Amino acid sequence: RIAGFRFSLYPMTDDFISVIKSALKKTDTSKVWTKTDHISTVLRGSIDHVFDAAKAIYLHAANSEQHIVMNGTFSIGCPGDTQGDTYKRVNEDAVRGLKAEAPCQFALYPMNEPDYMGLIMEAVDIAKAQGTFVQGVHYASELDGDAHDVFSTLEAVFRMAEQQTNHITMTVNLSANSPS
Amino acid sequence: SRIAGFRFSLYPMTDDFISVIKSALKKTDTSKVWTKTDHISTVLRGSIDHVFDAAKAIYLHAANSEQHIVMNGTFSIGCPGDTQGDTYLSKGDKRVNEDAVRGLKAEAPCQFALYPMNEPDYMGLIMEAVDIAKAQGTFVQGVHYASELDGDAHDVFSTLEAVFRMAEQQTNHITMTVNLSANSPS
Numbered sequence: 001r002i003a004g005f006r007f008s009l010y011p012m013t014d015d016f017i018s019v020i021k022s023a024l025k026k027t028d029t030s031k032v033w034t035k036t037d038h039i040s041t042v043l044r045g046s047i048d049h050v051f052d053a054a055k056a057i058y059l060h061a062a063n064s065e066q067h068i069v070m071n072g073t074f075s076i077g078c079p080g081d082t083q084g085d086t087y088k089r090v091n092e093d094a095v096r097g098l099k100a101e102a103p104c105q106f107a108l109y110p111m112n113e114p115d116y117m118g119l120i121m122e123a124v125d126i127a128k129a130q131g132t133f134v135q136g137v138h139y140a141s142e143l144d145g146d147a148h149d150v151f152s153t154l155e156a157v158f159r160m161a162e163q164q165t166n167h168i169t170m171t172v173n174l175s176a177n178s179p180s
Numbered sequence: 181s182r183i184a185g186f187r188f189s190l191y192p193m194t195d196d197f198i199s200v201i202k203s204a205l206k207k208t209d210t211s212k213v214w215t216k217t218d219h220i221s222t223v224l225r226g227s228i229d230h231v232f233d234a235a236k237a238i239y240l241h242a243a244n245s246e247q248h249i250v251m252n253g254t255f256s257i258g259c260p261g262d263t264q265g266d267t268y269l270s271k272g273d274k275r276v277n278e279d280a281v282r283g284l285k286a287e288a289p290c291q292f293a294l295y296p297m298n299e300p301d302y303m304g305l306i307m308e309a310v311d312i313a314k315a316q317g318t319f320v321q322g323v324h325y326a327s328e329l330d331g332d333a334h335d336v337f338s339t340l341e342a343v344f345r346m347a348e349q350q351t352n353h354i355t356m357t358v359n360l361s362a363n364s365p366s
Contacts, residue, residue, distance in 0.1 A: 006291075006325050008359065010191035010250060017365065035324075038366045039291045039359055042324050069191060071252045073293065073357065075325045079303055085324065105187075105220050107254065109295045109355065116297055117260050138216075138223050138266065139187045139256045139355070169295065169325070171254065171357060173189065178219050179198065 002086045003050045006042040007072020007172075009061055019068060023061035028090040029053050035085065040072070045087040047076070047159060055151040056091035062100035062147065062176035070174040074158055077111075077167035102150035105140040105173045108157060110165040119164060123157040130156065140173075150174070183267045184231045184348075187223040188253025188358075190242055200249060204242035209276040210234055214267045221253070225267040228257070228345060229275060236337040237277035243286030243333065243362035251360045255344055258353035288336035290360045291326040294343060296351040305350060309343040316342065326359075336360070 011019035024041075032045035032053045043053050054072070061068045108123050110116040124141055127133035132153040134142040143150050154172060161168045192200040205222070213226035213234050224231050235251075242249045294309050296302040310327055313319035318329045318339040329336050340358060347354045 004324055006323075008250070008252070010252075011193060012191065012195075012197040013193070014195045016193040016248075037323070038364055039289060039328075039361050044324070067197075069189070071189070071191075071359075073325060078325065082324075103219060107355070109297070111295070112298070112300055112302055114298055137187075137218070138185055138225070139254060139259070169293070173220055173252075175220050180219050 001077060002044055002081055003047040003074070003076045004042060004044045005050050005054050005072050005074050006040050007054070007070055008040040009057065009068060009070055011061070011066050011068040013066050019061060019064050019066050022064065023057050026060045027053060027056040028094065031087055031090050033085045033087045044085050047155065047162070048089060049087060051151065051155040052089040052091050055147065056095050058102070058174055058176065059095045059098040059100055059147055063098055065177060067177040067179055069176065070172065073169055073171045075169045076162055077165070079167060100147040100176055102145065102147040103175050103178065104143040104150050105137065106143065106154060107140045107171045108161055109169045110161050111167040111169070113165040119161045122160060126157050126160060127153050181264070182258060183225055183262065183269070184228040184255065184257040185223060185225045186231050186235050186253055186255050187221050188251055189221045191250040191252065192242070193248045200242065200245050200247055203245065204238050207241040208234055208237040209280065212268055212270065212273055212276050216266070227269060227271065228341065228348070230268070232337060232341045233275035233277050236333060237281045239288065239333055239337070239360060239362065240281045240284040240286050244284055246363060248363045248365060250362065251358070253358055255356040255358070257348050260353060286333045286362055288331065288333040288360045288362070290329045290336050290358055291323065292329065292340065292356060292358045293326045294347055295355045296347050297353040297355070299351045305347050308346055312342045312346060313339050
């Protein structure tokens with residue numbers, strides 16, 4: 001049972017290649033198998049390491065004061081998920097002090113799950129409990145607050161679904177330093 | 181009744197992003213779709229036809245600014261309890277951006293994932309998607325959690341719609357994420 005996170009970092013600035021390269025340097029991806037191509041980067045490890053690396057990359061990039069967005073898909077349990085390309089929360093210490101607002105829009109997709117609308121509803125209540133929820137929009141749920149919280153919720157919701165359905169995915173759209 | 185939707189974001193990797201995004205949307209004729217924009221994304225609602233017409237036009241216009249921009253978003257249709265509002269519907273209208281962007285070009289390397297919900301045979305449909313991509317000559321390969329496409333936007337968007345329609349036909353609720361990179365430095 002391998003967890004993954006195919007994402008992309010989008011820095012809305014002329015020096016985006018720099019911005020990107022930096023955040024991925026300041027992050028201890030020693031706990032996850034990584035691979036990048038022209039369109040995106042995929043992380044494969046445990047739910048812990050993956051959500052660990054993910055929050056670390058967002059925090060760094062966000063602290064660049066640059067308006068940057070993290071867009072990716074968390075996946076686990078894919079039928080026939082190759083048994084390869086895989087590896088404590090290493091970045092936990094380094095990022096503990098880092099702060100950043102994480103307005104987010106996510107969508108949970110429990111696959112071949114008859115009761116999927118129920119799990120999504122549960123997902124919301126989880127976000128309402130954690131105080132991160134904000135509202136529902138077409139095709140997604142809205143969150144906010146500090147990146148440490150938002151990411152807490154995302155992982156909570158992921159595990160909740162993860163424990164009920166074999167194959168689930170969850171897309172996230174986090175906007176760091178939005179102009180507005 | 182069965183309204184299609186597209187929630188997306190435009191990511192221009194340039195200091196002049198606010199302008200690039202405004203021009204792409206402004207240059208696109210969005211009269212055949214309901215639209216709503218917030219701090220994170222823009223959502224389009226209407227028929228599969230008008231939604232994909234708008235999506236492709238927006239991509240082509242953004243791409244033709246010669247800046248490195250990315251279109252990331254999700255196509256959805258058939259959501260249980262999906263409201264019947266927030267839409268523009270007119271089966272009798274032709275795609276409004278077709279002639280405007282016909283003469284436009286832009287490479288659309290893309291990574292996408294099909295999600296047929298509550299569908300026991302969802303892995304098979306994804307396989308069908310891969311075969312549509314090949315018969316169209318846009319298939320490049322498969323990667324973890326996604327299928328890859330390449331070629332001009334007209335063909336890539338044509339493939340995405342073919343895939344979307346194939347699945348929409350067999351399953352009630354399906355979503356399809358897309359990640360197209362235009363003018364990438366690579």
